[PDB]
Amino acid sequence: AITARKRRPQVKLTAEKLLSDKGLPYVLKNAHKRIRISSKKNSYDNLSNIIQFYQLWAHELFPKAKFKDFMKICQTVGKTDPVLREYRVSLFRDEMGM
Amino acid sequence: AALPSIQLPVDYNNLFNEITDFLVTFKQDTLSGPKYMAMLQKVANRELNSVIIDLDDILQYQNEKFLQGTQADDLVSAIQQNANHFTELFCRAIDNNMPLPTKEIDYKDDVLDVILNQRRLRNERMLSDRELFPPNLTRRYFLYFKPLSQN
Amino acid sequence: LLKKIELIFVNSLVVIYSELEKITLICDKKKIKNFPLCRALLRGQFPLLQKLTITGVTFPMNNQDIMNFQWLLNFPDLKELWIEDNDNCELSKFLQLLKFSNVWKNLEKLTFRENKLYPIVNLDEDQPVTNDDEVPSMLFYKENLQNLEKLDLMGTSISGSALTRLCEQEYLDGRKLRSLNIGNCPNIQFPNNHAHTARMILDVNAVLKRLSKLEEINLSHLSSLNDSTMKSFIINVPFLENLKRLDISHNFEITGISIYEFLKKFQMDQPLAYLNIDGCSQVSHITVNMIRAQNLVTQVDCVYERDVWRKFGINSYSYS
């Protein structure tokens, strides 16, 4: 019966999006393929070989945030969300189930 | 800011249809494909950019249609009356009908081809459920109306 | 048990129904790029349905039956029909349905409002015969439209002649009809004008002679109602003596001159009950204050700064 009034929306990294296909399943699809670590390279380069993939994945998943801030958000949702816990424990449960 | 509006004795849908009919049909048959479509093949080869329209061609087309017993709604008067809008109509008709190139161009060397190809690829990545451009960007030619002769 | 339902689809994200008496479907035209109840409306039947009110939905191009209002046959006894700002609908197709079926035994009210200027629609009085050795098709315009108390056609591109033909054919009864809205219709011209095709003329004398006892008129946004054209209403005052409520607001041509001479002539009938001239730029302040002082209108509204007419829920059900 009433004409609308606008209110500002907001978006944040929900655990559902973190569990979308481009979320952690993307990590499982691509991390072991893309990160490579070797004695043939120094420690700084090996650390960079990790960080480059996780940064690109983080930006492609949630481009809004800086990489460190994204990491804090990920650590904190990891500290809290039950479905994310069930997923992570399911990963190590699958490794147990091998 | 509300606006009033009025009815007027013109229709740009009908005239757009007339313009593309002229473009895909006409040739200078008194001198015996269409002049304009052949010229647009020259445009497609990137051999030409100055697209010239003769009002005399429009007049000859109107007279041919009237001779064949159908009214052409005097496109010459319309283009002589509100010329600027009919640049947009003629260019849209060309963009809707220009044939593909025949001469090789090394097509990737144009930045616009690469950037619009990349946008198309990105849009297909989206379109798998996981205009493309404003047409003036892609429009390479320049369109000009050339006046009526003494008659 | 649900008799009245109102779906107001503010946003988008990604059988017999005898109980239902009133259906309202209001949709934000920006967001609702589909027609939510289309399959239900075309397949099901809703026989008790007294009122239907559909706004803002986009009729799919892929199904011509939807565009031809074929679903709308499913609702007899539909006392009121309101249908507004549904972008891909047309009055043109609607009047085909009114031509070729006795679709309704009674409409008390109709309110059709397409948004864009579709091509000129004329009342299609062409009555074909299957063969000269056979009867024509009966044109069901009268028995469908006979019952209307309120006809609203605001913005619908209806030609003035089409409306005169509704009156001359007496498809509109004229006695049952008591309120009329044809505001914002560009294809309405008046006999005092000189620059038109004749089929856009609305012969107000013929029409007002037909439907004389109507109480309310709305010609709001009708730019074609210039001061010269208002002279037709002046000379036709004897054929509209039932009129109480007049809306000619948001007209950027109508000077206070026409208001005054219309009201002076109306006063030869005991003032007019109500007049709306909000948003009109040419209604001089001293003139409207003289109208009040002489008490020629019981109430006259002159909010020059009111930009819009579509009071939601009151004047329109197109959303916000």
> How would DSSP label each residue in chain C?
---EEEEEE------B-TT--EEEEEE-TTT--S-TTHHHHHHSB-TT--EEEEES----TT-HHHHTT-GGGG-TT--EEEEE--TT--HHHHHHHHHH----S--SEEEEE--S-PSPB-------BS-TTSPBPP-THHHHHTT-SEEE-TT--B-HHHHHHHHHTTSS-SSS--EEE-TT-TT-B-TT--SS-GGGB--HHHHHHHSTT--EEE-TT-TT--HHHHHHHHHTGGG-TT--EEE--S-SS--HHHHHHHHHHHTT---EEEEE-TT-TTS-HHHHHHHHHTT-EEEEE--TT------BTTTB-S--
Q: How far is C54 from chain A (nearest CA, A)?
A: 14
C223 and B4 within 8 Å at the Cβ level: the answer is yes
Place of tokens 């946003």: C11
Query: DSSP letter at B26?
Result: -
**What is the SS3 assignment for B121?**
helix
Judge: A3–C10 Cβ closer than 8 Å, yes or no: no
Torsion of the alpha carbons at B8, B12, B18 and B22, rounded to the nearest 10: 120
CA dist A72 and B97 (Å) reads: 55
Instruction: Give the Cα separation of C145 and C138 in Å (integer).
Output: 14
**Tokens, residue C103:** 């679709």
Q: Which of C167, C97, C171, C99 is nearest to C128 (CA)?
A: C99
* Per-position DSSP letters for B31-80, written without gaps between them: G---HHHHHHHHHHTTS--EEEEEHHHHHHHHHHHHHTT---TTHHHHHH
d(CA C310, CA C320): 9
DSSP C116-171: S-PSPB-------BS-TTSPBPP-THHHHHTT-SEEE-TT--B-HHHHHHHHHTTS
Sign of torsion, CA C258 C260 C263 C264? negative
What subunits touch chain C, counting only 3 or more CB pairs under 8 A? A, B
All partners of chain B with 3 or more CB pairs under 8 angstroms: C
Cβ–Cβ below 8 Å for B5 and C187 = no
d(CA C296, CA C293): 8
User: Given in angstroms, what resolution was this structure solved at?
Assistant: 3.2
Q: How far is CA C243 from CA A98, C211, C215, C298, in A?
A: 87, 11, 4, 13
The answer to whether the CB of C162 falls within 8 A of the CB of C120 is: no
- Write phi, then psi, for C276 (nearest 5 degrees): -115, 115
Between the alpha carbon of residue C309 and those of residues B125, C81, C219, C250, C274, the distances in Å are 45, 21, 12, 8, 16
- Look-up of token digits 């000077």: C255
| C-alpha span between B69 and C10 (Å, rounded) | 53
Spatial contact of C176 and C148, defined as CB atoms under 8 Å apart: yes
Find the CB nearest A1 among C10, C313, C320: C313
Method: cryo-EM
Report the gap between the CA of C313 and the closest CA in chain A (Å): 7
* DSSP, res B142: E
Which one of C6, C313, C320 has the shortest CB-CB distance to A4?
C320
The closest of C234, C246, C118, C91 to C180, measured between CA atoms, is C246
- A70, A13 contact by CB (below 8 A): yes
Verify whether the Cβ–Cβ distance B4 to C307 is below 8 Å.
no
Round to whole Å and give the CA distance between C206 and A82: 76
- A98 interface with C at CB cutoff 8 Å: no
Name the residue with tokens 């439907």: C211
Residues of B with CB under 8 A from a CB of C: 1-2, 4-7, 11
Q: Mutual orientation of helices B83-97 and B12-25 as an angle, nearest 10°?
A: 50
Residue pair B116/B138 in contact by the 8 Å Cβ criterion: yes
C7, C319 Cβ separation under 8 angstroms? no
Q: CA triplet C301, C307, C308: central angle to 5 degrees? A: 85
| Residues in CB range of C254: below 8 A, 6 or more apart | C225, C226, C227, C230, C248, C277, C280, C282, C283
Neighbours of B33 (CB within 10 A): 11
Contact A4 C10 (CB under 8 A): yes
CA dist C185 and C154 (Å) reads: 6
> b or e along C284-318 (b: 16 or more beta carbons within 10 Å of the residue's beta carbon)?
eeeebeebeeeebbeebebeeeeeebbeeeeebbb
* CB neighbour burial string for C202-230, b if at least 16 within 10 angstroms, e if fewer: bbbebbbbbbbebbbbbbbbbbbbbbebb
CA distances from A72 to A79, C58, C114 (A): 10, 45, 53
Rounded to whole angstroms, the Cα distance separating B33 from B120 reads 33
Q: Do C187 and B7 touch (CB under 8 A)?
A: yes
Would you call C186 and B7 a contact, using CB atoms and an 8 Å cutoff? yes
